Amino acid sequence: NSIAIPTNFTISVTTEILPVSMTKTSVDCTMYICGDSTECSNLLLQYGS
């Protein structure tokens, strides 16, 4: 039969940081796998999609 009633309050501000997006990257597959080499572009062409 014993209760505890608050008598004075406290208004507090927190913070919360949330990621939303990330950098939009894009790689050029041919230019990376073998770039500036026409002798390799044909070889890569047959390797699939």
Binding site: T23, K24, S26, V27, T30, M31, Y32, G35
Partner: protein
Amino acid sequence: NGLTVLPPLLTDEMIAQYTSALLAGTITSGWTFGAGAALQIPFAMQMAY
């Protein structure tokens, strides 16, 4: 090496024009601007609600 980073559709000066219109509605309208036409109400008299 063909690795490109594209820019976002929403610039960092347009984001600030949403999160300053999401912050002048809460102050002057409350929970109403997100549920229909915004209705003004004195700030004190909304904190008490």
